[PDB]
Amino acid sequence: KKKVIIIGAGIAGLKAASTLHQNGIQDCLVLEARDRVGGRLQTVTGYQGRKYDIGASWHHDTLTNPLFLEEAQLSLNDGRTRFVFDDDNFIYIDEERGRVDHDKELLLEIVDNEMSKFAELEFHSDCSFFQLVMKYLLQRRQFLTNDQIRYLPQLCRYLELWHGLDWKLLSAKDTYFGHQGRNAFALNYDSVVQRIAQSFPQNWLKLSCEVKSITREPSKNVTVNCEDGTVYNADYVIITVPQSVLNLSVQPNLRGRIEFQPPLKPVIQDAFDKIHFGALGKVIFEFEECCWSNESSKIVTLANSTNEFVEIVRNAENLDELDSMLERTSVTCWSQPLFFVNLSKSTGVASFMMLMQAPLTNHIESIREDKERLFSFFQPVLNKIMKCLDSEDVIDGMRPENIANANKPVLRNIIVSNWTRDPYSRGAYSACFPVDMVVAMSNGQDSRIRFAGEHTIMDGAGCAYGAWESGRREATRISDLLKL
Amino acid sequence: PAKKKVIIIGAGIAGLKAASTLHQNGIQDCLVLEARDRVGGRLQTVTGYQGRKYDIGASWHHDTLTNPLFLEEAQLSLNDGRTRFVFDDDNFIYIDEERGRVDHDKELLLEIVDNEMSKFAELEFHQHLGVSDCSFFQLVMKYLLQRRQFLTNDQIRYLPQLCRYLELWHGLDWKLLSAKDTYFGHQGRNAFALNYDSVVQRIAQSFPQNWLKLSCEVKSITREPSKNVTVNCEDGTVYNADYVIITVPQSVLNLSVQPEKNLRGRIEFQPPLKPVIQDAFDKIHFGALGKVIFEFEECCWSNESSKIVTLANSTNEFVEIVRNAENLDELDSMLERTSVTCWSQPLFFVNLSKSTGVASFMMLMQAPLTNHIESIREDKERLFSFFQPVLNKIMKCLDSEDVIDGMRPANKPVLRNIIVSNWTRDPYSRGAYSACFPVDMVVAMSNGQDSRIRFAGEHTIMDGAGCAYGAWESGRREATRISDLLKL
Numbered sequence: 001k002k003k004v005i006i007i008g009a010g011i012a013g014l015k016a017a018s019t020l021h022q023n024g025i026q027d028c029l030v031l032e033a034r035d036r037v038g039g040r041l042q043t044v045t046g047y048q049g050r051k052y053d054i055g056a057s058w059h060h061d062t063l064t065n066p067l068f069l070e071e072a073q074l075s076l077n078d079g080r081t082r083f084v085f086d087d088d089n090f091i092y093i094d095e096e097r098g099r100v101d102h103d104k105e106l107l108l109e110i111v112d113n114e115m116s117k118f119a120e121l122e123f124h125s126d127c128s129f130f131q132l133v134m135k136y137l138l139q140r141r142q143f144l145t146n147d148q149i150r151y152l153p154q155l156c157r158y159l160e161l162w163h164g165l166d167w168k169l170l171s172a173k174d175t176y177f178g179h180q181g182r183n184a185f186a187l188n189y190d191s192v193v194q195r196i197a198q199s200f201p202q203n204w205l206k207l208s209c210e211v212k213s214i215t216r217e218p219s220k221n222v223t224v225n226c227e228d229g230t231v232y233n234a235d236y237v238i239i240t241v242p243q244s245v246l247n248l249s250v251q252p253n254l255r256g257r258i259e260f261q262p263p264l265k266p267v268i269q270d271a272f273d274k275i276h277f278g279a280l281g282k283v284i285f286e287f288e289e290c291c292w293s294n295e296s297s298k299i300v301t302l303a304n305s306t307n308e309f310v311e312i313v314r315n316a317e318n319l320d321e322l323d324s325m326l327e328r329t330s331v332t333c334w335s336q337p338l339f340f341v342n343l344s345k346s347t348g349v350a351s352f353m354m355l356m357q358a359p360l361t362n363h364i365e366s367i368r369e370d371k372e373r374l375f376s377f378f379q380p381v382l383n384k385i386m387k388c389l390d391s392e393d394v395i396d397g398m399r400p401e402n403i404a405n406a407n408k409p410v411l412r413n414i415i416v417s418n419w420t421r422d423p424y425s426r427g428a429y430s431a432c433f434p435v436d437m438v439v440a441m442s443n444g445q446d447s448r449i450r451f452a453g454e455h456t457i458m459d460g461a462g463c464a465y466g467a468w469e470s471g472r473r474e475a476t477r478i479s480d481l482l483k484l
Numbered sequence: 485p486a487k488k489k490v491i492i493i494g495a496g497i498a499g500l501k502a503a504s505t506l507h508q509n510g511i512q513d514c515l516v517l518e519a520r521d522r523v524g525g526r527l528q529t530v531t532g533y534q535g536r537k538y539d540i541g542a543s544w545h546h547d548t549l550t551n552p553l554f555l556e557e558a559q560l561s562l563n564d565g566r567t568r569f570v571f572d573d574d575n576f577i578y579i580d581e582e583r584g585r586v587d588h589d590k591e592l593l594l595e596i597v598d599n600e601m602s603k604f605a606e607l608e609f610h611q612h613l614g615v616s617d618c619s620f621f622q623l624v625m626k627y628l629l630q631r632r633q634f635l636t637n638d639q640i641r642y643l644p645q646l647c648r649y650l651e652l653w654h655g656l657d658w659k660l661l662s663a664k665d666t667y668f669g670h671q672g673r674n675a676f677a678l679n680y681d682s683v684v685q686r687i688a689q690s691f692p693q694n695w696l697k698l699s700c701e702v703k704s705i706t707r708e709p710s711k712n713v714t715v716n717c718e719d720g721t722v723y724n725a726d727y728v729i730i731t732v733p734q735s736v737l738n739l740s741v742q743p744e745k746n747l748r749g750r751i752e753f754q755p756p757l758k759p760v761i762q763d764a765f766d767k768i769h770f771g772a773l774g775k776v777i778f779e780f781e782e783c784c785w786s787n788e789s790s791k792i793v794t795l796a797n798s799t800n801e802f803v804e805i806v807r808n809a810e811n812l813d814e815l816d817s818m819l820e821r822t823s824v825t826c827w828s829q830p831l832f833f834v835n836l837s838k839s840t841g842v843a844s845f846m847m848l849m850q851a852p853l854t855n856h857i858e859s860i861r862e863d864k865e866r867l868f869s870f871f872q873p874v875l876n877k878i879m880k881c882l883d884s885e886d887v888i889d890g891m892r893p894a895n896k897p898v899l900r901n902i903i904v905s906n907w908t909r910d911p912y913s914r915g916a917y918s919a920c921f922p923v924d925m926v927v928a929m930s931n932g933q934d935s936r937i938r939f940a941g942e943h944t945i946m947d948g949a950g951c952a953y954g955a956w957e958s959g960r961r962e963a964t965r966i967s968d969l970l971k972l
């Protein structure tokens with residue numbers, strides 16, 4: 001009854017629809033499991049109507065990012081502000097010393113560069129970003145001070161926030177990856193979603209439709225059917241659900257899962273072994289008003305470091321001696337690095353958007369509803385930030401004020417992501433464990449069972465534009481064929 | 485016609501290493517013919533005010549992550565605790581004449597757009613179709629053009645000047661620099677050699693002294709097809725040798741491909757340098773990086789960093805031109821618009837105080853400034869008058885008052901001396917090092933004139949090209965080959 005059925009209203013799915021329609025193509029559908037489009041792009045509303053992208057929030061590689069360029073043109077055309085360039089000089093904070101960024105004697109960023117060049121060279125078998133950092137420290141200790149060896153490895157972990165994976169879980173071979181230029185903070189990714197979503201017939205979209213199985217009818221027909229009984233049949237099928245969800249079509253009923261008939265060709269099934277997903281998480285701390293210095297919009301808190309980490313480095317005879325000397329509990333805000341976006345400086349909002357990673361993410365998302373517990377967990381670093389930003393310890397104003405505020409940051413609310421605990425996202429996005437999936441998805445189960453999504457592309461992989469393009473790809477293809 | 489196994493022309497790090505190697509391989513009867521009354525070549529350490537020393541040629545070990553010469557030095561230090569170098573990379577302080585310091589600025593964010601600029605340049609040439617190079621200047625203009633919608637007015641004004649620190653990497657004004665060659669990847673931090681001479685002497689001392697013959701200016705190399713090479717010093721002597729490793733500067737070697745034999749440093753080749761070598765000169769040129777040392781009594785200024793760069797003057801007018809231009813064509817035209825001052829180009833200052841304790845400044849300059857300044861390296865009064873404005877400004881931004889002319893004998897800076905390089909006017913260097921204007925040479929060089937007439941030096945190798953360690957490798961390269969040959 002339909003031409004092509006798009007599964008998923010994320011930006012990939014939306015783009016595909018947007019394209020088809022842009023090609024006159026008619027009679028198509030977008031089946032979304034949730035009661036909203038946007039997929040991993042969701043803007044939520046907090047205190048006083050402040051808006052926040054709980055999922056994606058940046059246009060990466062603005063130099064080449066084609067989705068960003070389109071937004072840029074729209075803005076050049078109507079003057080509407082769609083994004084702001086928020087890259088800033090990062091501020092790094094260690095519980096003990098405090099600020100360790102742009103340091104006269106620590107010069108951490110410079111060694112971090114060397115560390116980077118080292119990794120480029122090292123490759124050009126693959127270990128963990130952690131192991132790699134350790135190899136470097138060992139291999140260059142002769143040229144590193146005691147303080148550099150202490151904090152450098154901590155500071156360099158900000159990369160855990162780019163992947164949303166701790167350094168012992170992260171692939172070093174994929175850890176470093178130069179970005180094609182500055183980043184632009186989307187002042188409404190929801191505008192992008194809304195703009196694309198309303199660029200095709202609104203009657204194509206069918207929300208709360210969890211597709212349970214895709215059956216191939218050799219007779220040049222495809223049987224799609226949401227688990228609510230309703231069955232559809234279209235010429236072509238573009239599957240845009242997350243890799244983590246798709247990755248369920250190979251296990252022995254779980255929600256979101258799509259039963260493929262016939263099974264997914266092996267090449268694809270193998271890929272799920274050579275590619276994993278990450279768990280980047282977000283916590284929004286909403287303050288009554290800014291009462292801290294807006295020196296920068298990017299702040300990173302370093303996990304605790306031990307002056308006895310040095311002695312071990314200063315001793316190991318090799319990666320085996322060091323490897324063992326290392327294996328020689330409790331999880332707090334200081335157990336890992338935490339990336340804080342000070343929205344006050346870059347968007348004029350008295351809030352902090354903090355990014356977290358696996359394994360911490362999953363745990364904090366677990367207690368998303370426990371505000372007193374959440375505040376208690378982040379209070380230390382929150383206060384450590386305010387001090388460094390010439391302010392006072394945070395007051396808890398989440399419940400009906402204090403009067404003793406005025407000069408003290410008054411927390412009014414906290415918003416936590418829920419991607420790990422959401423059955424339709426089961427994670428943040430494609431991430432590397434210490435590749436081929438791109439091809440497996442690009443080719444497609446067949447001439448009519450295509451794949452799209454941030455995990456189905458090489459350029460922009462794991463990104464909004466990467467997904468946006470993959471949606472136009474598989475689309476523009478099915479656009480010409482049908483056109484016939 | 486004294487018989488020799490290998491005759492090395494030039495006692496710079498290239499030939500020194502060649503000889504050295506040659507020795508280690510047990511080769512005997514070799515000569516190192518050097519024109520100056522010294523060894524080292526573009527590696528020279530001069531003395532100044534109160535015994536202070538400075539390397540007026542090379543000063544750094546670049547790419548310390550893979551620099552064989554560097555590693556070799558670090559090793560010797562791992563075995564005796566001797567300080568030979570000092571990793572002096574710091575956070576650059578940028579000073580505009582007007583707006584004072586512009587580095588690490590939360591609103592200007594210069595270093596961030598520099599980063600984007602670097603990536604833009606990489607993205608422009610990594611996709612190498614029939615690319616077509618252009619000047620660095622022209623590249624930055626294209627960047628500003630394409631990205632004007634994402635730059636504030638102050639960034640468009642200062643960025644183009646800040647990114648010009650690169651001129652002091654090549655020794656060339658951005659209008660004369662090949663964009664295609666501008667951004668190279670410095671593999672690792674740099675180690676400020678604490679006496680490059682110690683590297684030179686160590687290597688020199690690594691072979692028979694009697695092999696070294698200073699003040700002998702080789703005027704010609706003749707290839708007797710009879711399986712031999714004849715070499716002639718100007719001192720009249722005439723040596724004969726199985727192999728010759730010419731390590732003279734590209735600039736000096738270039739003198740051979742032109743009629744006029746009586747040029748200081750010019751070697752006469754017979755047979756003349758093959759066509760592939762002559763023609764290779766049309767494909768690369770020499771840069772003019774220069775050094776000026778500002779020595780003061782003591783240090784009455786901040787030591788926040790050891791890297792300070794002074795940006796050239798910019799104008800808000802320039803910003804308006806970028807905003808209104810339509811393309812690269814109109815931009816240049818609209819750019820069509822007196823006299824050189826210490827603010828007509830960026831200048832790079834190495835604040836030796838912080839990194840070495842010495843109350844002195846090591847300042848680098850490019851072409852054409854380098855030539856003009858070296859031309860008047862004697863007029864100390866004029867030099868001070870030239871660099872007074874930036875000298876002050878630096879001191880200002882560094883918390884201090886204006887400079888005091890104390891050259892001809894507590895909180896006020898007092899300049900005692902000023903040392904200037906002389907590479908352009910030196911007949912045996914005629915420049916600084918190989919540099920690109922908007923590979924043929926390396927190939928033609930490393931493949932030699934023939935089995936016997938070979939070439940070494942910073943201009944004869946790819947890895948570390950133009951670097952002290954590259955020249956050094958080229959030495960070990962040729963020496964090894966011959967060694968093998970002599971072994972058989």
Ligand SMILES: Cc1cc2nc3c(=O)[nH]c(=O)nc-3n(C[C@H](O)[C@H](O)[C@H](O)COP(=O)(O)OP(=O)(O)OC[C@H]3O[C@@H](n4cnc5c(N)ncnc54)[C@H](O)[C@@H]3O)c2cc1C
Binds near residue numbers: 009041055241462
């Ligand atoms: C915390 C976080 C921060 C991020 N930050 C950035 C950033 O700064 N920049 C950037 O570029 N990217 C960022 N991303 C990634 C970006 O969000 C994704 O790359 C992009 O949204 C993926 O798009 P998609 O269209 O493939 O899938 P959408 O999630 O992304 O998912 C596909 C759609 O399929 C639906 N679906 C699943 N199962 C079924 C089913 N059985 N039936 C019907 N529908 C189904 C889903 O509900 C969903 O709507 C971030 C992600 C997270 C989690």
Ligand SMILES: Cc1cc2nc3c(=O)[nH]c(=O)nc-3n(C[C@H](O)[C@H](O)[C@H](O)COP(=O)(O)OP(=O)(O)OC[C@H]3O[C@@H](n4cnc5c(N)ncnc54)[C@H](O)[C@@H]3O)c2cc1C
Binds near residue numbers: 493736907915
């Ligand atoms: C101002 C300046 C700063 C620099 N800074 C750095 C730096 O920080 N780091 C770095 O790695 N590199 C630096 N370099 C480059 C480095 O100095 C050179 O790459 C290297 O010294 C070249 O060595 P060479 O042995 O090839 O040649 P030299 O240029 O060393 O040549 C060898 C010798 O040939 C002799 N000679 C010439 N003609 C004749 C003749 N006719 N007969 C006999 N002998 C002759 C010369 O007098 C010379 O001593 C710098 C160069 C300059 C000019």
